[PDB]
Amino acid sequence: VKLFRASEPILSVLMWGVNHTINELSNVPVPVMLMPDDFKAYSKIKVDNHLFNKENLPSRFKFKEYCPMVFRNLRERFGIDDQDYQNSVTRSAPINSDSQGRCGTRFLTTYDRRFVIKTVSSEDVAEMHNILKKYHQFIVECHGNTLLPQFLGMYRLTVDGVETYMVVTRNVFSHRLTVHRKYDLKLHVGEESKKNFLEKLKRDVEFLAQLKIMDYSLLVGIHDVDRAEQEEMEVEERALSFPRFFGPGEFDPSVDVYAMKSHESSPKKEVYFMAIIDILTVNPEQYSKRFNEFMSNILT
Amino acid sequence: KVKLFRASEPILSVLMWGVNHTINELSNVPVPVMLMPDDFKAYSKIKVDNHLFNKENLPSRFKFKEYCPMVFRNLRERFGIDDQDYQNSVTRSAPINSDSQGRCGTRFLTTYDRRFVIKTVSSEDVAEMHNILKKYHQFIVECHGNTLLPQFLGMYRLTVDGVETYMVVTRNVFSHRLTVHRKYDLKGSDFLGQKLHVGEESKKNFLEKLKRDVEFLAQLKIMDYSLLVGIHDVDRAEQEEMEVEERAEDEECGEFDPSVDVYAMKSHESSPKKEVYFMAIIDILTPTVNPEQYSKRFNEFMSNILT
Numbered sequence: 039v040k041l042f043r044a045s046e047p048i049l050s051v052l053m054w055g056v057n058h059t060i061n062e063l064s065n066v067p068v069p070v071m072l073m074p075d076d077f078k079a080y081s082k083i084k085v086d087n088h089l090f091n092k093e094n095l096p097s098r099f100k101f102k103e104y105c106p107m108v109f110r111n112l113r114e115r116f117g118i119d120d121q122d123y124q125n126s127v128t129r130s131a132p133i134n135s136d137s138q139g140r141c142g143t144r145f146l147t148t149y150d151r152r153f154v155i156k157t158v159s160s161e162d163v164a165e166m167h168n169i170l171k172k173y174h175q176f177i178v179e180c181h182g183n184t185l186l187p188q189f190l191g192m193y194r195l196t197v198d199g200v201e202t203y204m205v206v207t208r209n210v211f212s213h214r215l216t217v218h219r220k221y222d223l224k225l226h227v228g229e230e231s232k233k234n235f236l237e238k239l240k241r242d243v244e245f246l247a248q249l250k251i252m253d254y255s256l257l258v259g260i261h262d263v264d265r266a267e268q269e270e271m272e273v274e275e276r277a278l279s280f281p282r283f284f285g286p287g288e289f290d291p292s293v294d295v296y297a298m299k300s301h302e303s304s305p306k307k308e309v310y311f312m313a314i315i316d317i318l319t320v321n322p323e324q325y326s327k328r329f330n331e332f333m334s335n336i337l338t
Numbered sequence: 339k340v341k342l343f344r345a346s347e348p349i350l351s352v353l354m355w356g357v358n359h360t361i362n363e364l365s366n367v368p369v370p371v372m373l374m375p376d377d378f379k380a381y382s383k384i385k386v387d388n389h390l391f392n393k394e395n396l397p398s399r400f401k402f403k404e405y406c407p408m409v410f411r412n413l414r415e416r417f418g419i420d421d422q423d424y425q426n427s428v429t430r431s432a433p434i435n436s437d438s439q440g441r442c443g444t445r446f447l448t449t450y451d452r453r454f455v456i457k458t459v460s461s462e463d464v465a466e467m468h469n470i471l472k473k474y475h476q477f478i479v480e481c482h483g484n485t486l487l488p489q490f491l492g493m494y495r496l497t498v499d500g501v502e503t504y505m506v507v508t509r510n511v512f513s514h515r516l517t518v519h520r521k522y523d524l525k526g527s528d529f530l531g532q533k534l535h536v537g538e539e540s541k542k543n544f545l546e547k548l549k550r551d552v553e554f555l556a557q558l559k560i561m562d563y564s565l566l567v568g569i570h571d572v573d574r575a576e577q578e579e580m581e582v583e584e585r586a587e588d589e590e591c592g593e594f595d596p597s598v599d600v601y602a603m604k605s606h607e608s609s610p611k612k613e614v615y616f617m618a619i620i621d622i623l624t625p626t627v628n629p630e631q632y633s634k635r636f637n638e639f640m641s642n643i644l645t
């Protein structure tokens with residue numbers, strides 16, 4: 039029984055909007071392939087209830103969903119279940135998170151830290167449409183394995199004649215390990231991690247070049263295990279259907295897809311998280327090349 | 339899993355989509371302990387403007403409005419209809435055209451499973467309903483859902499291709515399985531001799547139901563309603579419909595549940611031939627004496643018809 043119980047009313051509208059459009063999609067069948075007209079598509083919905091269901095939702099609001107068919111397919115390709123994405127958005131009010139880039143304004147996270155909700159400009163929205171078909175293709179050929187943002191949906195909400203644009207992505211950071219430090223650059227890991235990380239980075243940057251984009255940056259979160267233990271102990275005494283277990287330096291790489299463990303032969307044990315950040319808002323191929331040079335040598 | 343709202347007419351696709359939409363929405367709103375006065379002036383409204391999305395059965399652009407979602411939701415449960423079951427009858431497969439009748443020969447739909455009746459109505463009928471709803475609701479509580487009156491279940495306004503339709507949803511007076519051979523619409527003062535013979539509990543139960551119903555229509559200042567009588571003939575159905583269900587299920591392309599067919603009555607255990615009867619008060623809206631006398635005139639005549 040989903041009261042879209044939230045702090046801001048715009049947040050309630052987001053929850054209701056995601057719930058509706060996801061339910062709505064469950065009655066559309068999955069095509070063999072997407073069509074050119076799926077990249078020009080949307081669904082708009084105007085709600086004007088009166089003296090009904092006003093307890094949490096505004097009585098009047100609009101919710102537009104850009105290219106629903108495309109983002110369903112991206113979700114599939116990032117391995118995100120539509121019922122799962124719907125539950126993270128709707129079981130509980132999304133919550134204010136810190137920051138993951140200079141991108142837009144308000145930063146939010148689903149109550150279970152799985153997905154990141156950014157508020158974006160209208161100009162950002164346009165750039166997304168510009169790039170969406172070549173992005174989609176890029177995700178197809180890399181089997182959804184990128185350091186690029188992993189776009190999951192894109193929405194326009196209107197409450198009280200104000201339009202807000204939101205973009206939903208996969209969290210760069212663990213939805214369960216806290217990030218103690220972040221770095222935004224415009225470090226010793228396993229040789230497998232290192233080889234794989236450089237492989238993604240080479241393609242991701244090259245695609246960003248062929249799409250004539252510069253000025254994106256690498257975001258780096260660092261989780262300190264020893265610290266997480268000390269801070270576990272510190273709040274201890276002051277107090278997955280069942281709870282998943284996990285050891286100390288530990289995560290699920292199907293879930294926390296940007297995460298790397300620090301090499302075993304290395305002092306204090308740590309989880310890193312590195313993503314390419316701010317794809318929206320030297321020539322680009324030159325910037326590509328210099329970006330490849332730099333973030334390469336951060337790692338051993 | 340999967341509701342592609344396919345139907346002959348877009349208006350019907352839209353009805354199916356909207357019933358699905360509104361019943362879902364309601365599942366996320368708690369059943370209050372009592373309806374407030376403001377629930378009776380309440381509505382849900384929704385405008386869909388899809389573009390190059392979800393276009394195969396549904397129109398790109400349409401509007402759907404539900405009058406009094408809480409009230410009707412309540413009535414539905416007072417009538418022992420599960421919202422879940424109600425959604426299925428409308429959404430599983432398209433509602434269909436009817437066997438059909440009226441006074442100007444009215445055109446109505448049935449849910450694919452013949453369990454519910456949908457009837458296009460006028461702007462003025464919607465208003466009539468609103469005028470009577472609060473009292474209608476009060477009445478439904480006081481007899482615990484036991485009436486011959488239309489069991490009203492939903493009230494909608496669809497708009498497609500710039501045209502607004504009003505529709506009302508009701509329990510079917512007739513069985514969803516047994517065929518009705520004979521229809522009669524007793525419009526006040528085919529029987530006047532042809533008597534109708536039923537069990538004692540059935541006969542006393544019918545009479546007291548009738549008695550409060552007409553009283554209720556009187557204490558609302560309503561007249562010109564009629565008694566809709568359907569007869570299903572058991573022997574005839576055995577003759578005509580012997581190998582029909584089986585031959586539907588091939589190579590090429592007298593009992594009932596009282597819980598479902600609520601207006602039904604078996605013919606008396608020692609009676610000419612085996613029959614099932616269906617009586618209800620019909621035409622309560624707007625599709626010389628006074629209403630409190632028309633009441634007496636109705637209870638008199640419809641009493642005399644059962645022995």
Ligand SMILES: CN1C(=O)[C@@H](CC2CCCC2)N(C2CCCC2)c2nc(Nc3cc(Cl)c(O)c(Cl)c3)ncc21
Nearest residue numbers: 437438439444455457488506508509510511512620621
């Ligand atoms: C309670 N109720 C009615 O009030 C109306 C439809 C109303 C809907 C709101 C105003 C009109 N009616 C009637 C429909 C036209 C007006 C009276 C009904 N017909 C049936 N089932 C039925 C009736 C006939 Cl006559 C029939 O041949 C078949 Cl197959 C099913 N069951 C119930 C009703």
